[PDB]
Amino acid sequence: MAVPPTYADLGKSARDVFTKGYGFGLIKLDLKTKSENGLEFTSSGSANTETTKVNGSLETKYRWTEYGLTFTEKWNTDNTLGTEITVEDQLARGLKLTFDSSFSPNTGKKNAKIKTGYKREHINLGCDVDFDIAGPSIRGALVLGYEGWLAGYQMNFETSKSRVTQSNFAVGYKTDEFQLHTNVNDGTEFGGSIYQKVNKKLETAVNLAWTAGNSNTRFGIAAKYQVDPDACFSAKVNNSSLIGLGYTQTLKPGIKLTLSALLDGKNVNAGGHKLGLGLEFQA
Template sequence: MCNTPTYCDLGKAAEDVFNKGYGFGMVKIDLKTKSCSGVEFSTSGHAYTDTGKALGNLETECKNNFAPGYEAADFQLHTHVKDGTEFGGSIYQKVNEIEMPINLAWTAGSNNTRFGIAAKYKLDCRTSLSAKANNARLIGLGSTQTLRPGVKLILYQL
């Protein structure tokens, strides 16, 4: 059975060619691109020639996961988006024999925010102490002693 078009659809294709895509007194641009990792970027803007006013926007859409970061010898910064719903990141700093990371994460659509901080202090070439805490009120303490190459004694207290 054939669907007949409604009265308002008659001649719509021809009318669209004559009326759409023309901006008298206006300059308009629309750009879209997609990265190989699935991140979509779209930007649009328009300027009115008679008033000189301009308007623009930039949109980013992340779909498979997105994780930009920065890494140096003693500093790292990492952020991520997972499935478009979980956002997080970490900061890591090493000063002399002390390592300190901080982790943050948030899940969209909920009040589920996670935060953690940790530290590791290297006493000598064979011994280190570590501690961690998070917003779920969990605290961990640890000690690592290398007895000989390849054999470690690790003690944890949660």
């Protein structure tokens, strides 16, 4: 509440308006269970309708909610295997540690990662270490909160070149109905976003982005309307002349279908246009 988001979550809501309810050029099959604690499973399959390729993935998650633990296993069709242990609020509220392993038999390459984060009123800090080989590399991030305002920094240091490779600032204002976010990456990429929860059923988002030193500017408008509690529409435009339409319907409890289309002006329907379909099963 007074506890700020993490750095990566700055601007999340507006990003969400743009991305959720769309899956252009994919058929997506998703299958989830829930458990407040104990076992949880998510399995996913995805067909790229341009390439014919069919990906698949399974995640398994036990939550020992008593000791703030979460163990998670990951597998996909690329053969990549993964494990992830997480402790939260355990030695101190709200501290968070995470070990994370990856093994690809498909190269014999492995990867390991520690992610630390500390969180309290006004502050949200994280340090992340990537024992890549050609790593390590270290991402640190801090965000401060002051009566609705937010400011933060995020850097990454790669020990192989022994240099900062990434330096990112962001400042913004965040209430529950309203959100401003701005940021520049590497003193080079400018972005900003406004998010408005206009009423119970409508959300809107504007996104700007441009580059020093190029006089061009990119923007998109986007929205999401919650028609009844079983239907949800999403529309978005950008100044590259792309339209994005997304409808999501609950057919029955646990089952949501979402159709989506992506259109290029001024060739509508003149030339070829991405469609997508997605089916989500909750059990």
